[PDB]
Design a protein around this ligand. Structure first.
Ligand code: HEC
Ligand code: HEC
Ligand code: HEC
Lengths: 106, 106, 106
């Protein structure tokens, strides 16, 4: 998928998580976020379209998604243990990383 | 190790997982696949040898192993929980990633 | 942070894990190591400043942190299961990755 589509997946599934009632819904939503974050790694944001895929900005962009993936991992395992409110809180701290990337590259 | 040898390791241990009887066997084979996928990620595939190392294709190639690694992660945790058939089903799901990369970069 | 600061974080927190009494201490040190490894991924080591950012050497460098991150993952889950001594053993194993990178790129 293209970058904007993966971002919609991330935004929609974060909201699913905030409204979720059980761990199965949280896990499903986090797994869709993980897929979207991985697919976004191959993308070039519009503000960097003319730069090298290996420029420091593009390597930083891709590390941003690795950071997000490890945060998704933490929430996924919290949900797996049945700690639904903890998984939802961990999902909320993802926004720190969403915003940090947006500030630089959106 | 070189890319062909790492792919040998991935294919051999996928077959071990398919025929395994117990969780320890599945977990051992998955651990070897994780190691091979990481070692493979540093390679330049022959199809991309004559392209720029800074090409989008090289970045995409490496994201494919990141997808594979997160799928291996799921199967590893299922095997760690002792869920042999669920871990085998998660390992079966790797094949779509294997073939999708091959279609582009073998 | 720069590479040297991230290396300090990794080394200091490994020392904490080596002297830890309980899983909470180990998990806290391992999460700080995970953050430093992700941050180090954006660095260029002095020895590779004369290489392309997409050169095989720089890919090897960045993938070395992926290897470390999955080893940090193993120790984190072992600590989460209450296997403190097994987590410490896994952190000891991590050191082979640190030294192998230093041998190549320091
Ligand atoms: C970089 C490492 C990013 C991370 C982490 C996240 N996002 Fe993002 N986002 C990024 C870019 C470069 C862009 C611009 C895309 C464009 O073509 O303009 C975006 C954009 C969005 C959008 C708007 C997309 C659209 O349809 O117009 C949304 C709704 C969005 N991002 C959400 C989002 C969330 C919820 C994230 C974390 C959970 C997140 N992004 C992470 C880069 C990066
Ligand atoms: C890209 C991200 C890949 C993923 C994921 C997987 N494979 Fe692969 N594979 C890839 C390439 C570029 C190549 C060509 C290597 C060459 O030098 O020609 C291969 C090759 C194989 C092979 C044949 C090896 C040989 O002796 O030539 C096998 C048996 C193989 N790959 C198996 C395999 C399996 C089982 C995978 C998923 C579990 C898998 N590969 C993923 C690129 C990528
Ligand atoms: C590459 C993939 C590395 C891995 C994995 C680890 N380290 Fe490292 N480290 C690396 C380099 C290239 C350098 C040289 C940095 C420089 O600017 O000279 C280092 C350096 C250190 C240092 C000293 C830094 C300084 O103050 O001069 C320490 C204490 C250190 N590294 C520790 C360390 C630990 C504990 C690691 C694993 C847990 C580890 N490093 C991994 C490259 C890489």
């Amino acid at each position: 998928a293209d970058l904007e589509d993966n971002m919609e997946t991330l935004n929609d599934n974060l909201k699913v998580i905030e409204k979720a009632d059980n761990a199965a819904q949280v896990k499903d939503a986090l797994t869709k976020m993980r897929a979207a974050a991985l697919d976004a790694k191959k993308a070039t944001p519009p503000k960097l379209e003319d730069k090298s895929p290996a420029s420091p900005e593009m390597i930083d962009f891709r590390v941003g998604f690795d950071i997000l993936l490890w945060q998704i991992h933490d929430a996924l395992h919290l949900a797996n243990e049945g700690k639904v409110k903890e998984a939802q809180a961990a999902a909320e701290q993802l926004k720190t990383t969403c915003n940090a990337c947006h500030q630089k590259y959106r």
